[PDB]
Ligand binder design. Structure first.
Ligand SMILES: *[C@@H](C)[C@H]1/C(=C/c2[nH]c(/C=C3N=C(/C=C4\NC(=O)C(CC)=C4C)C(C)=C\3CCC(=O)O)c(CCC(=O)O)c2C)NC(=O)[C@@H]1C
Ligand SMILES: *[C@@H](C)[C@H]1/C(=C/c2[nH]c(/C=C3N=C(/C=C4\NC(=O)C(CC)=C4C)C(C)=C\3CCC(=O)O)c(CCC(=O)O)c2C)NC(=O)[C@@H]1C
Ligand SMILES: *[C@@H](C)[C@H]1/C(=C/c2[nH]c(/C=C3N=C(/C=C4\NC(=O)C(CC)=C4C)C(C)=C\3CCC(=O)O)c(CCC(=O)O)c2C)NC(=O)[C@@H]1C
Ligand SMILES: *[C@H](C)[C@H]1/C(=C/c2[nH]c(/C=C3N=C(/C=C4\NC(=O)C(CC)=C4C)C(C)=C\3CCC(=O)O)c(CCC(=O)O)c2C)NC(=O)[C@@H]1C
Ligand SMILES: *[C@H](C)[C@H]1/C(=C/c2[nH]c(/C=C3N=C(/C=C4\NC(=O)C(CC)=C4C)C(C)=C\3CCC(=O)O)c(CCC(=O)O)c2C)NC(=O)[C@@H]1C
Ligand SMILES: *[C@H](C)[C@H]1/C(=C/c2[nH]c(/C=C3N=C(/C=C4\NC(=O)C(CC)=C4C)C(C)=C\3CCC(=O)O)c(CCC(=O)O)c2C)NC(=O)[C@@H]1C
Ligand SMILES: *[C@H](C)[C@H]1/C(=C/c2[nH]c(/C=C3N=C(/C=C4\NC(=O)C(CC)=C4C)C(C)=C\3CCC(=O)O)c(CCC(=O)O)c2C)NC(=O)[C@@H]1C
Ligand SMILES: *[C@H](C)[C@H]1/C(=C/c2[nH]c(/C=C3N=C(/C=C4\NC(=O)C(CC)=C4C)C(C)=C\3CCC(=O)O)c(CCC(=O)O)c2C)NC(=O)[C@@H]1C
Ligand SMILES: *[C@H](C)[C@H]1/C(=C/c2[nH]c(/C=C3N=C(/C=C4\NC(=O)C(CC)=C4C)C(C)=C\3CCC(=O)O)c(CCC(=O)O)c2C)NC(=O)[C@@H]1C
Ligand SMILES: *[C@H](C)[C@H]1/C(=C/c2[nH]c(/C=C3N=C(/C=C4\NC(=O)C(CC)=C4C)C(C)=C\3CCC(=O)O)c(CCC(=O)O)c2C)NC(=O)[C@@H]1C
Ligand SMILES: *[C@H](C)[C@H]1/C(=C/c2[nH]c(/C=C3N=C(/C=C4\NC(=O)C(CC)=C4C)C(C)=C\3CCC(=O)O)c(CCC(=O)O)c2C)NC(=O)[C@@H]1C
Lengths: 67, 161, 160, 160, 169, 36, 641, 161
């Protein structure tokens, strides 16, 4: 499967949390290709700042043999 | 219940059409097989006790089912099981004579699973015993009449699964 | 209710309302005004009815408010007057409905079992209702009093 | 009458009749003068009522008197007139009684069974009763006609 | 079964309340409407058979498939059963009109009605349309006659229509 | 002996016709007859 | 809307009688094989079948000509055949132009329909269809159709149909007899409806058209009389046992009360007294009283003694009072001595199941009576009439929108649902698409997201479940004794316990996902998604269940709450239809509420309960608080101390 | 779920017994019919939408069910009925391949009756729809596969009824 490696910064609106929240804020994680559109929308519409997107696993221009 | 004539007539009537060629074909097949189906039913009725005895001997006796802790263990449970076998034979005969399994739907498979799942009767053992009944009847009535009864006994068996 | 009785009878016979049932419903509809007047009187005078009836009951039947009696003590006496208020409310319901059905349904089915469970002498409850009937009858005209006394009497008869 | 209905309902529940049932009994027993005068007025005018009704019906159904018809023949025609009169008598019975019981026990239960056995069409009978209703109510005051119409309507409803 | 007075009494007994001014006003409204309700019931009694027949005829004119093969009014058996059901609805609607309360319809018509029609394959929608046809016929009849109050007439029929019909929105 | 086979025999498929617009579309049918 | 459902099962009334159905039902209602009588009827009918099919063929082929002869004799002034879809004194031909196109269409249709149903009756070997659909057609069409004209048309059709059968007195006689039945039945007046009056004021009165009764299967009626032969008395007693005990326990188990049978067959006791004493017997007590609570026992007793289920709330109330007071003897005496019993069965007739086709049926107890009449009724232990009748009078219950069976136990682990067939307990209720289920928050009540939608994610503290978060850093984000190994592993095992309920056996854990989580490559959300989509989850919790049961359990595990109603259920179920299990998991974990309640670092947890689950947990003796549901009296030392 | 092979294996494993000759011949019976089941499944998989369409068009269209006031009225409910039919056809094919109706009893019927009585979905009409599917499939896959698919569609109908 294609896997992106997305880096994002998520700010905190509507709440001043007192527990540890740094892990949720600026995170780098592997995302399956199929979920990246939905995840991009979710991070954006939450107020996030997607710094970086790369194709960690997979190739461009691949018509077959992606799963 | 509905027999074959009712099924054909209702199919014709719901469309407002007279009895057509295919309807007449199926009806004449029913009427032509009727005499041999009646003879098979008579033979089965004359041998119901022996049929159930032999099927029980083949499939159920001398197994975990009849020993202490088995669902057929006590005398009441044994008698109830052979009575159920008689039910299955009788209603297979009804379905054969009617040329349709509607009697099995409305008078047998209605809450058969309710009854057996509530009482914890073993379904696999029942299916094995019904298969034994089918084999015994086929040996007694003939291969072709055996198949004619076997469609309905298999119908009950698949209803049990 | 009278209307409900007529309707359920007609339905039991699987027919439309007969002329007699329509006549009875017409009588009910026409007597609505007087029934409402009686109910208005009973509701408006509920406090004085209950106080006077309870006074007459206690003075006539002191044992129930004497030591060892079921209604002995300030709180038990309060609860007894509360029960009297309950039954007066049910009487007003029966008066407006034109029938004893609400009284039966709310306050008389199993009343014996309840009061046996509580240890309350049921005959004294019947007497409390009698006192309430006597007090209420003085507050209205003779025909109105006669109409209300039937509901009071139904309660009394069911009690004892 | 309504008294018998009240007693039947009370006995079925093994109780004395409630206040509402007795009040309905009183209202019925007070309207007796109107019921009696209606019954009398319909009684002496049987001939005119039946004549108007029968001419209206056989105008509505000329086939009944036509050859092959149920009423064809003087005997059958006279029997039909007899039936008109008998049902008017039943209506007067119902008016006096205050309910449909005298009508229903005498000339409605099994009426379809009877007339089917005689090949008198039941829809012919309901049309006959409708015209008899019109003719009879024509000979009554407005209030008396309003009082006595629902009995004709009940016969009509039972007929079909 | 509950009529308007019984419904009011139940509401007030739930809270242990004596009947207040609003209760007396509602009872007064019912009692003053009683004459019109009785007249409407009597008019229905005078025309019930013809009302049912004409409503059925109109329904089978509006939905001709009902009396054609595979229609649920097809064959005299089903046709008679359908006219019987219409008679049921009219009789219980008359009851509800007299009681000024639709609980009689809930208890003795609607509860389990969907289940029965689903079991038999009786189509609900045409039955609801027939109920509405009978309602319109009753309303026109009441308008024609010398009746003063006729707004209550729609209440039972509409109730049945709302209680039995499928939810679309 | 083989004549006994009815349910075990070769099935005889029955004709069931696809349902078509009933009279409830009559007006639209007229509109269809006047849309060409 | 209606607040409860008694259930709905397929109903199959008989439309008409046929010879095989007649014979087979005659044998089957008596619980026996077909004997010489029924088998001989079948033989004769099958023999006649070839001739009958010949009649049907010739009539369907020439139906056009027969109908044309009828239409030409009946109508005058035009061609009736322009559109195809002995003489009574009053007969006169009908004018096509005057009579109208619609009525002409109905005339031609009716003639063809008469011929068609005549052929049907010929094939069926019974005129019952003709009688059923023709007795009372006259009154249906008198006012728009001439009866004399119809009679003449039927006579013409009869003559034309019989004209094709000069063969011999085999085809001709059958055709003539069936047409004569049609003629006499069209000439018949409408019979009165069968009225089933309400036995009391709590039960409505009904009526059934006689044609409906004629079509339905006739209930065999057994009456004990002194003069019956011994074999007939045996049949009657067997019927009594089949009615009271629901099957022939004498044939099955040799169970019998001999002195009662001798008394009833001698006429010492009536069949009513025999029923009374049999239903009081220890046999009946052991079979249909001891195994059941009184509430279910009285419903079964109504089946056995009256042939019907309870009709109303008032009736079940009254009879449950009776059985509470005097037990089984009082119940049996009340049922047998009821006016209803004597109205139907009297003194001699064995009680019979009434049900559909025998008399007009009520809607209010339709499904419950369908269930009660099944032979599986003894294995329903939960009362069905009191429950459904009470639920009519009350708002919608706390229950899954698709039924009680779709609610799993709210236990730590396991997907335990009631099985529809095992000890049937189904409680259908009409939840429309917009209902919302009231859920109890596991935490501060005011944090329930219904009243406080911004409370979503507010951890419940001591009032709710423990919450596992990857708050601490992950290891290697060399050295030993790095403390960040215990927290991350505790969270991994917590996630396993959340998705699956309990920890897996050795070799089952998704080790690659665990290392990929421990290396910061994924988030907690991604890991639980992998767990939920794992083949192990599919096999355990998706595959073995009804689709909506699987979805409901999934929702509880992943969102920490049951579904609110039809909106969530429908969306997940539709995804299940279109895409499948992995897509359903994706939808649940990618939903907005998951993000709000659980971020990328929180293991899901139980956030809400149904009332039933909370009651299960907190209503037991050892967990029930002292102040809940009772009066708490303050204890004070006596003043005299 | 269990297929015919798993049925035999479970019957042998609950007794702790190795497979004897009778079990072997039952497995031989299942292997004998497996080619037929694969071909029938392929045809049905190719034509699933068309069977559903023709069965709807022959049973439910232009009836009260689709007209205003019927349970198939409105597009959401129409799509719902088609969706249910897709499930029924697909699970009937699954069971047919397995040779056992167990998957139907567990995925389809365990809760569906309560679901349909809750939603108010008419069971007479849906049974008619499944029967129409039965005839359409029987027309496509032939006599033997038609009867086998019949068995499991009738099973769904009986479970609903
Ligand atoms: C000597 C006692 C007589 C005799 C006996 C005999 N019995 C069988 C077979 C069975 N007997 C039973 C009986 C019971 N099982 C129970 O659970 C109970 C109650 C505790 C009883 C009484 C059963 C169930 C069987 C079936 C065998 C099995 O265990 O599965 C046989 C064999 C008959 C045959 O042909 O197989 C025999 C010989 N036979 C006589 O002639 C003696 C008078
Ligand atoms: C042998 C077949 C298996 C077996 C049977 C068994 N059955 C029961 C009990 C009952 N069986 C039924 C079934 C029916 N009754 C009907 O009327 C019909 C419709 C035609 C059917 C299918 C019923 C209702 C009962 C209980 C009530 C009654 O007696 O009728 C038992 C007894 C269970 C108990 O624990 O009491 C048994 C033993 N058991 C096996 O192990 C065999 C595989
Ligand atoms: C045609 C088949 C008939 C018909 C169908 C129909 N069904 C629904 C709604 C639902 N059907 C289901 C079915 C299932 N749940 C399961 O778990 C399974 C898998 C084994 C099945 C088959 C469900 C869950 C629903 C409810 C969905 C929702 O939440 O909305 C409808 C719509 C009913 C409504 O009120 O929207 C329809 C129309 N209806 C007919 O009239 C046809 C005879
Ligand atoms: C205060 C002296 C200065 C200042 C602060 C400021 N901080 C933020 C936002 C965040 N700060 C953190 C830091 C931490 N969170 C943790 O959990 C820990 C580790 C234990 C640390 C050190 C984070 C993660 C954020 C973002 C997420 C969140 O706030 O919940 C802001 C930005 C506010 C905003 O919403 O834009 C500010 C203002 N700013 C100054 O000017 C001061 C000099
Ligand atoms: C009159 C000379 C001719 C005629 C016309 C006619 N029929 C109707 C109405 C109906 N006809 C039927 C018929 C049948 N019901 C059945 O079950 C069968 C098989 C035995 C038949 C043939 C029915 C059910 C109706 C009522 C519903 C409907 O309109 O279809 C009318 C209209 C009546 C009206 O009052 O509007 C007319 C004019 N029928 C004859 O037989 C004559 C040849
Ligand atoms: C006419 C507008 C529609 C129609 C009707 C139809 N109904 C049935 C059968 C039954 N109808 C009922 C309904 C009720 N029973 C009650 O007690 C009450 C409450 C007061 C109602 C509304 C019942 C229970 C049945 C079955 C039992 C019986 O016949 O008494 C049928 C016959 C169904 C069949 O073929 O078996 C018909 C035709 N049909 C239409 O097409 C109209 C929409
Ligand atoms: C045997 C010594 C003689 C004999 C007996 C005989 N009796 C009957 C019939 C009946 N016997 C009774 C008696 C009782 N039934 C009871 O329940 C009890 C009370 C505990 C008693 C004493 C009855 C009631 C009958 C009639 C009903 C029945 O058959 O059970 C018969 C049969 C008569 C018939 O015509 O069928 C016979 C043969 N007959 C002799 O010849 C012996 C001298
Ligand atoms: C008393 C401590 C609590 C209480 C009780 C209560 N119960 C009811 C009504 C019923 N209770 C039953 C019970 C049973 N059915 C059985 O078969 C058995 C097993 C032996 C039992 C115990 C039933 C069937 C009813 C319904 C009776 C009826 O039909 O009316 C009520 C009345 C409910 C009503 O609506 O009338 C009450 C009050 N209620 C409390 O608040 C106490 C905590
Ligand atoms: C051991 C002494 C006996 C035994 C046990 C046994 N249990 C199961 C299956 C389950 N056990 C549970 C139990 C619980 N779930 C909870 O939430 C709680 C509290 C924390 C308990 C105690 C559950 C829910 C199941 C089913 C789900 C699952 O197993 O994960 C089995 C296996 C049954 C099967 O095949 O599903 C067994 C064997 N069996 C015996 O014979 C001993 C007497
Ligand atoms: C106040 C007049 C009485 C009272 C109330 C009380 N309620 C709770 C707890 C809950 N209340 C609800 C109610 C609803 N939730 C909904 O969504 C809706 C529909 C709009 C309603 C009506 C619920 C679900 C709860 C449970 C917690 C939660 O909110 O999720 C309590 C607390 C009970 C406890 O033990 O904590 C109380 C006190 N109590 C009284 O004594 C008053 C008469
Ligand atoms: C016209 C612009 C297009 C077109 C239409 C067309 N439709 C059908 C058949 C049906 N149409 C519907 C639609 C609805 N039913 C509803 O309840 C609603 C929601 C309010 C809608 C819109 C349905 C359900 C059917 C099925 C038949 C029936 O009513 O039972 C057809 C016939 C298809 C066939 O073969 O039966 C046609 C032709 N066709 C076009 O080409 C246009 C683009």
């Amino acid at each position: 499967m294609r896997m992106f490696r997305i880096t994002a910064c998520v700010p905190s609106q509507t709440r001043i949390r007192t527990q540890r929240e740094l892990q949720n804020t600026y995170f780098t994680k592997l995302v399956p290709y199929d979920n990246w559109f939905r995840e991009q929308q979710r991070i954006m519409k939450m107020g996030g700042k997607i710094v970086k997107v790369e194709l960690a696993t997979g190739r461009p221009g691949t018509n077959a043999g992606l799963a | 219940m509905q027999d074959a004539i009712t099924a054909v007539i209702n199919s014709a009537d719901v469309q407002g059409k007279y009895l057509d060629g295919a309807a007449m074909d199926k009806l004449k097949s029913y009427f032509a097989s009727g005499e041999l189906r009646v003879r098979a039913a008579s033979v089965i009725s004359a041998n119901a006790a022996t049929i159930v005895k032999e099927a029980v001997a083949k499939s159920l006796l001398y197994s975990d089912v009849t020993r202490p802790g088995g669902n057929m263990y006590t005398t009441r449970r044994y008698a109830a099981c052979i009575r159920d076998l008689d039910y299955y034979l009788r209603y297979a005969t009804y379905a054969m004579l009617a040329g349709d399994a509607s009697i099995l739907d409305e008078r047998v498979l209605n809450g058969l699973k309710e009854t057996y799942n509530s009482l914890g009767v073993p379904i696999s053992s029942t299916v094995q015993a019904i298969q034994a009944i089918k084999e015994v009847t086929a040996s007694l009535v003939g291969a072709d009449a055996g198949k004619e009864m076997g469609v309905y006994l298999d119908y009950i068996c698949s209803g049990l699964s | 209710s009278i209307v409900t009785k007529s309707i359920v009878n007609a339905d039991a016979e699987a027919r439309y309302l007969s002329p007699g049932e329509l006549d009875r419903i017409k009588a009910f509809v026409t007597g609505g005004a007087a029934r409402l007047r009686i109910a208005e009187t009973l509701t408006g005078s509920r406090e004085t009815i209950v106080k006077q009836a309870g006074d007459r009951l206690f003075q006539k039947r002191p044992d129930i408010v004497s030591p060892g009696g079921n209604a002995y003590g300030e709180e038990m006496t309060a609860t007894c007057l509360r029960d009297m208020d309950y039954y007066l409310r049910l009487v007003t319901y029966g008066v407006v409905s034109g029938d004893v059905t609400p009284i039966e349904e709310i306050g008389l089915v199993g009343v014996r079992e309840m009061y046996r469970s509580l240890g309350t002498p049921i005959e004294a409850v019947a007497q409390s209702v009698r006192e309430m009937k006597e007090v209420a009858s003085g507050l209205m005209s003779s025909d109105d009093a006669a109409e209300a006394s039937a509901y009071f009497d139904f309660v009394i008869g069911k009690m004892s | 009458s309504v008294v018998s209905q009240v007693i039947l309902q009370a006995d079925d529940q093994l109780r004395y009749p409630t206040s509402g049932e007795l009040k309905g009994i009183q209202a019925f027993l007070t309207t007796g003068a109107q019921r009696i005068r209606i019954a009398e007025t319909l009684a002496e005018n049987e001939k005119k009522i039946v004549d108007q009704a029968q001419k209206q019906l056989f105008k509505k159904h000329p086939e009944y008197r036509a050859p092959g018809g149920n009423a064809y023949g003087q005997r059958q025609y006279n029997q039909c007139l007899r039936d008109y009169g008998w049902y008017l008598r039943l209506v007067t019975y119902g008016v006096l009684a205050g309910n449909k019981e005298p009508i229903e026990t005498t000339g409605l239960i099994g009426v379809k069974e009877m007339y089917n056995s005689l090949n008198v069409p039941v829809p012919g009978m309901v049309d006959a009763v409708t015209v008899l209703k019109d003719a009879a109510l024509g000979l009554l005051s407005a209030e008396d006609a309003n009082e006595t119409a629902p009995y004709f309507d009940y016969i009509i409803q039972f007929m079909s | 079964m509950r009529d308007a007075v019984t419904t009011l009494i139940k509401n007030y007994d739930l809270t242990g309340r004596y009947l207040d001014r609003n209760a007396m006003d509602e009872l007064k409204a019912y009692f003053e409407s009683g004459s019109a309700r009785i007249a409407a019931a009597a008019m229905i009694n005078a025309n019930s058979a013809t009302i049912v027949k004409r409503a059925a005829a109109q329904l089978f004119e509006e939905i001709p498939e009902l009396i054609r093969p595979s229609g649920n009014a097809y064959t005299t058996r089903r046709f008679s059963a359908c006219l019987r059901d219409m008679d049921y609805y009219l009789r219980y609607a008359s009851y509800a009109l007299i009681a000024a309360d639709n609980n009689v319809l809930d208890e003795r018509v609607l509860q389990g009605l969907r289940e029965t029609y689903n079991s038999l394959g009786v189509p609900i929608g045409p039955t609801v349309r027939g109920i509405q046809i009978m309602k319109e016929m009753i309303e026109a009849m009441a308008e024609d006659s010398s009746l003063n109050s006729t707004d209550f007439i729609a209440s039972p029929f509409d109730h049945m229509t709302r209680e039995l019909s499928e939810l679309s929105v | 002996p083989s004549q006994v086979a009815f349910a075990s025999g070769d099935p005889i498929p029955q004709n069931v016709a696809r349902r078509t617009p009933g009279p409830s579309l009559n007006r639209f049918k007229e509109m269809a007859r006047q849309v060409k | 809307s209606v607040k409860a459902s008694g259930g709905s099962s397929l109903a199959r009334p008989q439309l008409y009688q046929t010879v095989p159905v007649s014979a087979i039902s005659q044998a089957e209602q008596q619980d026996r094989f077909l004997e010489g009588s029924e088998l001989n009827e079948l033989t004769a009918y099958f023999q006649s079948g070839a001739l009958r099919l010949e009649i049907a063929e010739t009539l369907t082929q020439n139906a056009d000509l027969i109908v044309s002869r009828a239409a030409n004799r009946i109508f005058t002034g035009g061609s009736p055949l322009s559109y195809l879809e002995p003489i009574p004194p009053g007969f006169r031909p009908i004018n096509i132009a005057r009579y109208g196109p619609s009525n002409m269409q109905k005339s031609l249709r009716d003639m063809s329909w008469f011929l068609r149903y005549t052929t049907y009756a010929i094939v069926a070997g019974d005129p019952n269809i003709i009688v059923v659909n023709t007795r009372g057609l006259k009154e249906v069409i008198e006012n728009a159709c001439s009866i004399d004209a119809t009679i003449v048309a039927i006579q013409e059709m009869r003559a034309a149909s019989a004209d094709y059968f000069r063969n011999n007195a085999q085809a001709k006689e059958i055709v003539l007899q069936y047409f004569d039945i049609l003629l006499s039945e069209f000439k018949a007046p409408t019979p009165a409806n069968k009225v089933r009056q309400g036995p009391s004021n709590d039960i409505q009165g009904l009526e059934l058209p006689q044609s409906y009764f004629n079509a339905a299967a006739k209930r065999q009626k057994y009456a004990m009389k002194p003069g019956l032969s011994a074999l007939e008395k045996n049949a009657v007693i067997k019927a009594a046992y089949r009615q009271i005990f629901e099957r022939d326990i004498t044939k099955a188990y040799s169970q019998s009360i001999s002195y009662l049978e001798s008394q009833v067959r001698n006429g010492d006791i009536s069949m009513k007294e025999f029923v009374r004493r049999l239903a009081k017997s220890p046999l009946y007590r052991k079979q249909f009283f001891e195994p059941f609570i009184n509430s279910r026992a009285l419903e079964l007793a109504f089946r056995h003694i009256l042939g019907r289920g309870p009709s109303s709330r008032e009736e079940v109330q009254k009879y449950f009072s009776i059985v509470s007071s005097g037990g089984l003897p009082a119940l049996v005496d009340a049922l047998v001595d009821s006016q209803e019993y004597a109205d139907y069965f009297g003194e001699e007739t064995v009680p019979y199941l009434r049900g559909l086709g025998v008399e007009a049926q009520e809607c209010r107890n339709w499904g419950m009576q369908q269930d009660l009449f099944s032979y599986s009724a003894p294995f329903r232990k939960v009362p069905q009439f009191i429950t459904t009748f009470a639920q009519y009078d009350r708002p919608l219950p706390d229950q899954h929108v698709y039924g009680s069976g779709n609610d799993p136990l709210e236990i730590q682990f396991g997907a335990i649902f009631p099985k529809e067939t095992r000890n049937p307990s189904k409680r259908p209720a009409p939840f429309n698409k917009d209902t919302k289920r009231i859920l109890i928050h596991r935490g501060p009540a005011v944090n329930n997201q219904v009243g406080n939608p911004s409370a979503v994610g507010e951890f419940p503290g001591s009032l709710g479940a423990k919450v596992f978060r990857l708050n601490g850093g992950l290891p290697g984000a060399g050295t030993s004794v790095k403390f960040g190994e215990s927290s991350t592993q505790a969270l991994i095992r917590a996630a396993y316990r959340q998705v699956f309920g309990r920890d897996l056996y050795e070799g089952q854990r998704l080790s690659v996902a665990e290392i990929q989580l421990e290396n910061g490559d994924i988030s907690v959300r991604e890991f639980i998604k992998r767990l939920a989509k794992s083949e192990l989850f599919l096999k355990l919790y998706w595959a073995p269940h009804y689709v909506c049961k699987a979805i409901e359990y999934m929702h509880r595990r992943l969102l920490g709450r049951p579904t609110y109603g039809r909106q969530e259920m429908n969306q997940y179920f539709d995804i299940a239809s279109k895409q499948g299990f992995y897509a359903v998991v994706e939808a649940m974990i990618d939903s907005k509420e998951y993000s709000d309640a659980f971020g990328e670092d929180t293991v899901p947890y139980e956030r809400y309960l149904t009332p039933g689950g909370l009651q299960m947990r907190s209503a037991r003796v050892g967990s029930l608080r002292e102040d809940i549901g009772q009066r708490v009296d303050k204890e004070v030392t006596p003043r005299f101390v």
